[PDB]
Design an enzyme around this catalytic site. Structure first.
Site: not given
Ligand SMILES: Cc1cccc2c(C#N)c(C(=O)NC3CCN(C(C)C)CC3)n(Cc3cc(-c4ccc(Cl)s4)on3)c12
Ligand SMILES: [Ca+2]
Lengths: 234, 52
Positions: A42, A88, A185-186
């Site tokens: 991603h 992913d 991420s990653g």
């Molecule tokens: C920034 C941030 C702030 C507030 C809410 C979210 C939030 C929602 N809902 C996500 C997120 O990922 N969404 C995913 C996207 C992919 N889909 C797929 C199944 C279709 C599921 C929800 N991130 C971003 C984020 C969150 C993270 C991690 C958190 C813990 C980890 Cl281990 S990695 O890294 N980036 C968010």
């Protein structure tokens, strides 16, 4: 990362950083070997053109140890799907080989059978990165690391308002405000065994950050051990 | 508990049963020690080791 401490000189050598055209860290990475970097698929859609930086712990203050390598080849998993984030994972081939030193070393890749039974059944693992320190906050400039306990598969699937495929696994806390976030991420999720660290996961996603009832979703690396070796073979 | 199921069969790293007996192995960067259980770092920076 949300919580945890900053990586001290030498603690997180296998950490890798993905920087875009404006030299900004958008994602994390894991050093597999001098010529190879592991990362989330991603992330590949987060930048039109990017490079990798290693051995960095303070984005805004060069420690003379950093090193930026150009990506020569991007090996994504054709089965990955933005729709579910299943599969992913990705591997990157560097134009130039890395040079291991103080804060630049590779994580070890285990054996699925051994990993799943020994490592994966450990108490906790460790995730790291220059991710946001708070769900809605901004990117950190201090390389961070946090010890995340492993989460039961059932509890996992159940606690998620999303489909937890078999290429994913939970790690993190139920209520405690410690968990990875955007930017990591990653990134690398590793597990220590007798003071040796093995790549056990890949920071993938989460229903927010540190949220109560929600955990951290990582890419179960053992499931792609075979896929990773091959990607390196060529 | 039994064999690799018991204290990783005393291997430094990879352990894997096969005919009532243990067999130890190491990731690349490490060479198996005399005792055939420990794992000796080949290069200066074997994987999985923090640099102090
Ligand atoms: C920034 C941030 C702030 C507030 C809410 C979210 C939030 C929602 N809902 C996500 C997120 O990922 N969404 C995913 C996207 C992919 N889909 C797929 C199944 C279709 C599921 C929800 N991130 C971003 C984020 C969150 C993270 C991690 C958190 C813990 C980890 Cl281990 S990695 O890294 N980036 C968010
Ligand atoms: Ca710096």
């Amino acid at each position: 990362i949300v919580g945890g401490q900053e990586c001290k000189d030498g603690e997180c050598p296998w950490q890798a950083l993905l920087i875009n055209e404006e030299n900004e860290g958008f994602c994390g990475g894991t050093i597999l070997s001098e010529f190879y970097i592991l990362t989330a698929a991603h992330c590949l859609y987060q930048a039109k053109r990017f490079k990798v930086r290693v051995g960095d712990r303070n984005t805004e203050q060069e420690e003379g140890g950093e090193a930026v390598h150009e990506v020569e080849v991007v090996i994504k998993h054709n089965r990955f799907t933005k729709e579910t984030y299943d599969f992913d994972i990705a591997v990157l081939r560097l134009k130039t080989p890395i040079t291991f030193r103080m804060n630049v070393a590779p994580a070890c890749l285990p054996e699925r059978d051994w990993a799943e039974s020994t490592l994966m059944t450990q108490k906790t693992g460790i995730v790291s990165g220059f991710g946001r320190t708070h769900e809605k906050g901004r990117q950190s400039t201090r390389l961070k690391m946090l010890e995340v306990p492993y989460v039961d598969r059932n509890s996992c699937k159940l606690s998620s308002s999303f489909i937890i495929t078999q290429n994913m696994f939970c790690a993190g806390y139920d209520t405690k405000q410690e968990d990875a976030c955007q930017g990591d991420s990653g990134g690398p999720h590793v597990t220590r065994f007798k003071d040796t660290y093995f790549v056990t996961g890949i920071v993938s996603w989460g229903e927010g950050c540190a949220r109560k009832g929600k955990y951290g979703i990582y890419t179960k690396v053992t499931a792609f051990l075979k896929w990773i070796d091959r990607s390196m073979k060529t | 508990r039994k064999l690799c199921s018991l204290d990783n069969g005393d291997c430094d790293q990879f352990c894997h049963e096969e005919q009532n007996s243990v067999v130890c192995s190491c990731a690349r960067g490490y060479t198996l020690a005399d005792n055939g259980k420990a794992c000796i770092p080949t290069g200066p920076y074997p994987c999985g080791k923090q640099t102090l």
